[PDB]
Amino acid sequence: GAPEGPGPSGGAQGGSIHSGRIAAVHNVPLSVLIRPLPSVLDPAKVQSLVDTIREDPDSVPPIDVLWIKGAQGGDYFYSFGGCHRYAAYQQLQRETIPAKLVQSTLSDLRVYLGASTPDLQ
């Protein structure tokens, strides 16, 4: 019952030109979010965010997210922040979360994970 859609097919892929670069807000599924950085959550700040999304979902600005592809088009989304907003969105069991996508290169990731950087495929 997951919201399948991406990957219009599975075989015609072959050097597909992206629709030009477009860095804007996008609802990225919670099921494909990568979080390799833990952070102690606070119950007072999470309730405030949970109250903001419930009181007004358009009153909560998006978060920054790095968007990088692997050696095989495998798209990988990394989120270094909004950790609390994730707990608030997670509780609402919502299907996706607002997040600004930022196309980057593996080198940029090294600046952040210049130690536990895995091999993207």
UniProtKB/Swiss-Prot annotation:
Listed EC numbers: 1.8.98.2
Tissue: Widely expressed with highest levels in kidney, lung, spleen and thymus.
Binding positions for ATP per the UniProt entry: G82, C83, H84, R85
GO molecular function: ATP binding; oxidoreductase activity, acting on a sulfur group of donors; sulfiredoxin activity
Keywords, comma-separated and alphabetical: Antioxidant, ATP-binding, Cytoplasm, Disulfide bond, Magnesium, Methylation, Nucleotide-binding, Oxidoreductase, Phosphoprotein
Keyword field contains Phosphoprotein: yes
InterPro entries: ParB/Sulfiredoxin_dom (IPR003115), ParB/Sulfiredoxin_sf (IPR036086), Sulfiredoxin (IPR016692)
GO CC list: cytoplasm; cytosol; endoplasmic reticulum membrane
Cross-referenced CDD domains: Srx
GO BP, sorted A to Z: cellular response to oxidative stress; response to oxidative stress
Modified residues (Phosphoserine): S16
Top-level lineage group: Eukaryota
Cofactor: Mg(2+)
Subcellular localization, as worded in the UniProt entry: Cytoplasm
Coiled-coil residues: none
Primary localization class, coarse: cytoplasm
Catalysed reactions, semicolon-separated: S-hydroxy-S-oxy-L-cysteinyl-[peroxiredoxin] + [protein]-dithiol + ATP = S-hydroxy-L-cysteinyl-[peroxiredoxin] + [protein]-disulfide + ADP + phosphate
PANTHER family per UniProt: PTHR21348, SULFIREDOXIN-1
Function: Contributes to oxidative stress resistance by reducing cysteine-sulfinic acid formed under exposure to oxidants in the peroxiredoxins PRDX1, PRDX2, PRDX3 and PRDX4. Does not act on PRDX5 or PRDX6. May catalyze the reduction in a multi-step process by acting both as a specific phosphotransferase and a thioltransferase.
Family, per entry: Belongs to the sulfiredoxin family.
Protein name, UniProt field: Sulfiredoxin-1
Species for this entry: Homo sapiens
